[PDB]
């Protein structure tokens, strides 16, 4: 039948945001809050085309938005965010009521300072 | 009388009858319907830019669209 | 296959209990211990004789109510959709039909014989 | 073609031949009817799970509740047959001669 | 003598495990059965010694023949006796069972249960006292203390 | 280390069964105005160990026409399935985190019934036939009602996942939203567990042990251990399913202590119900079970359907 | 006959269970959603014999979405040629787990 | 982000696996290298053998069967 | 080492189920049926089915308990026969076993078998789900139908069961 | 009174204690101290899969803590 083509490995070089899955699930509220405004264009591409291998440029754009988000939260306030995600990391699957004081302290950090 | 022919059976018919009757007069079926409507399992998709819809807002921070606040508000 | 691993370990445990019952303790002198015992006297024949039973309706009754258990058992996934009316309506209709069939065969002495 | 489908269709055909040829027990005939129910059950369920066509997963539950009430009807018929005779053999059914 | 020392240790172990429980069967023909029921009394327990009533004969450890054995009963007595776990012991309880007693003459009485089964432990009385019955069970346990089964088996 | 967890599940059930036999005899003695095993060993303990050895010794042996395959495969499946019931039980974090556990409980309980059934058929001496059909009748009675009461008590809060059930057991125990349903279920567990002849017609004196008329002197230990594991099994499942403790978070020892204390005192209550009441009747079991439990269970089920719509208590079902 | 009191009363009680691309209960896809949308858009106002004259290609695309039969044929040929070349000993390949 | 990560990963497996195919089958006749199975030209959803073929047992076993009977 | 595990469990299912449908004494048939139902539950469970196999295990197995009750109550022979007793029973059991081993042979040493269809010989990790990020868990919402959309269907099913109850009672009542 | 039945209950309850404490010890011994990430649905399994993908040693519980920002 017909032929198909694929993007070569020239196009598939975008650095992954190689943090663990628990912290990535943990900071997800403010991950969707500040970033993830331009990625709805990626999502709209993905639904209105139903064609991945085509929307990969805005996939690069959302990956660099996520890495810039993590760069901003590492360079500025604060340090006990590490304590917060390792407090949400432990309790088997993530329950957002296992750790509330550290959520409040991280929120006070990023709210009063950023 | 009608009570103690088979008394645990008539008590079962009584709790059965109130189980039939009571959800008709019910001030919380609308709350169950609202809460069960407002738990999204899948992704709320974006849409094409608009034909200037003065609704369905530009940022989900903006309370133009359908938000929910009555969870903490009883 | 981890529950299959547990099934394997329990199979090995049960077979080692079989072998420690059979082969370890002592000898095996047979030839009268094998006789069928009822209560002290050698009976006529054995089992597998046609053993006519009391209940007839009750096993079929169990079968059909187990079938309506099968239709009723997805009640938690019933309770979360936007059609509350059809949910509660068909749930009440199924349990009420179960009670109706039970009420018929209760009033028509379908259980009041050789129970 | 999903090779497990071959063995399940094989089990269906063997259960059908077992339903057809039978020695003396109508109990065994109802038992092979139950087995054929199970074969169609497992094949239809593996179909629905290959297709991800999970709106219609009504085939398993409804097929087996209906065919099980069929088996219950057959069991009551066997109760009646063994009531009006001594046993339930294929022999001593040769009356009502054609 | 590491081999015979291990044999002595294991034989002592299995003999102790034998003499622990000795759960009987509740055979009990005549009023020595009533005396057995009053050996099941709170004032004289048997479950202090693991003597536990187990009615099925294929797992009872001993058989307490109690009550007057008759000729109409004796085939049932031995056809119960012959199917049992392979160690088996007989406690003959009462003057009827262990030598006929008062009915020693007088047809359809087996002249003591010695004519049917091997009988280890005799306890005589009409009735035996419950204290004497428990003493008979203790001396049965001392017979279990002197088995030397595996010692005989190894030095064979 | 998974083999080590298999070992730490298969080893303590054996000591559990053996010292449960001890506590049966001793509680039954102190109930019945007498005294239990006191002389032998330290107070009783090494005499149930000696009972294990004593029943190992007795050299099992076959009946006349008892076909050997079915014969020796019945109690092996009994003890194997009686072990594999304890797979998903949430002693703080269970062995296999099943996405559905209670229907698995019903399945393996029915398999224990089949084990009793196959032993009663294969022993083949007409009394095992009598006792096997008595067991078949009391299982006609007791897999409808227990399963539907289960469906009721999981409808409000459970949703088949026992970890979410121990999430639910925080504010109030589930004994308070369903106490009469719980009493009917406790009666059904005492029946289906086939102990406490209040609701048991298998080990009667009217018969002589219809499940074990002449099986063999060896695997009497297997069948015995299977039924007492059934007792510990359904009492642990009762202790989890209804009540318990808001556990020490990410700390297991406090929850394990409190759960063990609740479960074992409830098992003493179970044994104390066994030590009290006369035996039961075949036709009275059919009549009593169906025509007293069943419409009340249906009424509790329909009211626990309507209560998440009467008070918006629909579960947060994952 | 084929009576559609179904249609005449105006109650859709049996149409919701019909094919894929009907309303699966939450807004999910099936495995072969688009290929049925192709075939049903081809074969509506069509008299069921020119559905096999004309809409043949798209229906066969749907059948090969469902069974994936030629795909399994190609993959099996690749596996068996892989087996015969590694049996011969021509360049046991390293591409997995490495570069 | 998870969607785009899955996209890059399956495109990586498809490109490298068609290179594997073009290396491994290039001697037997017939066999065009990368033609579609289907008569149309759209992004067909793969089958976990187009992705996970010939990954030597353990990898495909932990990929396709892990969620079923583990954790 | 194993990757054909659903095919393997299906072979165990076909063995137990041919020995089932070869008609020995029905108690041995029920032994075969409980073995076959258990491994069929295992097949559909290890395929990806969440609960429906354990469900049918429960239902179908209680049905087999009722079938045991009637095959003990009604009619057995003076000596019931097992698989390896008779000429015909042993012959059908071993030839069903031979068909099983022969198809295993002609799949494992071949490419394909075309007795009724072109059967592809390799285990069914193909074709299979490519990790859908669902979280709605297809069988749960699937049986969460019959209640939201399933209006007429449960009506006629429950009505069939009610008619089944009155039919059984009147057939035994017809004396 | 019940003064003598308590040692049997206590020994048999420590026999019921040891599966829970042993199981918790094995869970925390098996995964780097971490309480075991139970995976209910395929979302959680795919998240655990990318977790064990980004580790390097193919064990998810390392979890590479906030250091591959660069
Ligand atoms: S010895 Fe005396 S007490 Fe015993 S059975 Fe004979 S008459 Fe009765």
Numbering used by the authors:
A (entry chain A8): 1 to 114
B (entry chain A3): 10 to 83
C (entry chain D3): 1 to 115
D (entry chain 4L): 1 to 98
E (entry chain S7): 24 to 179
F (entry chain D1): 1 to 318
G (entry chain S5): 1 to 99
H (entry chain AM): 73 to 143
What does the paper say about this structure?
The ETC is composed of four large membrane protein complexes: (1) a H+-pumping NADH-coenzyme Q (CoQ; ubiquinone) oxidoreductase (complex [C]I), (2) a succinate-CoQ oxidoreductase (CII), (3) an obligatorily dimeric H+-pumping CoQH2 (reduced CoQ; ubiquinol)-cytochrome c (cyt c) oxidoreductase (CIII2; cytochrome bc1 complex), and (4) a H+-pumping cyt c oxidase (CIV) responsible for O2 reduction. CI is an ∼1 MDa membrane protein complex with 45 protein subunits arranged into two “arms”: a peripheral arm that extends into the mitochondrial matrix and a membrane arm that is embedded in the IMM (Hirst, 2013, Sazanov, 2015). In mammalian heart mitochondria, the majority of CI is found in association with CIII2 and CIV (SC I+III2+IV; respirasome) or in association with CIII2 alone (SC I+III2).
Initial 3D classification identified four classes of SC I+III2 particles. We concluded that the most distinct class with respect to the position of the CI peripheral arm belonged to the closed state (or active form) of CI (Agip et al., 2018, Fiedorczuk et al., 2016). The assignment of the closed state was based on clear density adjacent to the CI Q-tunnel for the NDUFS2 β1-β2 loop (residues Gly52–Gly60) and for the ND3 TM helix 1 (TMH1)-TMH2 loop (residues Pro25–Lys54). Thus, in the closed state, conformational flexibility in the peripheral arm may be transmitted into the membrane arm. In the SC I+III2 class containing the closed state of CI, the density corresponding to ND4 is of lower resolution compared with the surrounding ND2 and ND5. Surprisingly, the CIII2 MT-CYB that is in close contact with CI showed lower overall resolution in the SC class containing closed CI than in those with open CI. This indicates that this MT-CYB subunit has increased motion or is more disordered in presence of closed CI. The decrease in the local resolution of this subunit only in the closed state of CI strongly suggests that there is crosstalk between the two complexes and that CIII2 may be primed for CoQH2 oxidation upon the closing of CI.
